[PDB]
Amino acid sequence: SHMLKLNLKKSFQKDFDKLLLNGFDDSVLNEVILTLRKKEPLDPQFQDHALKGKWKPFRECHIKPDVSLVYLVKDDELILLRLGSHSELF
Ligand SMILES: [Br-]
Ligand SMILES: [Br-]
Ligand SMILES: [Br-]
Ligand SMILES: [Br-]
Ligand SMILES: [Br-]
16 A cells, blocks of 8 residues: 655756646656556556666656656655656756
């Protein structure tokens, strides 16, 4: 029953506000967060994958083809780092 604790980093809060004010519909994002919080598997279409290099141990989930979520599960928390297109974030 217990979910991962959400940890929203400053950069994520800024990304998310900027997206909301330009029309973003967060329904799928909230499903994806709920899935990750319940330690349930993400469907293949999200192309969820571990990042490499300096971005380790973060993972990228493609909420939509132009919106990625960069996040980490550790310490019983779901840490949400960035939300935006791959082009803007990398
Ligand atoms: Br935007
Ligand atoms: Br799209
Ligand atoms: Br802990
Ligand atoms: Br961290
Ligand atoms: Br892109």
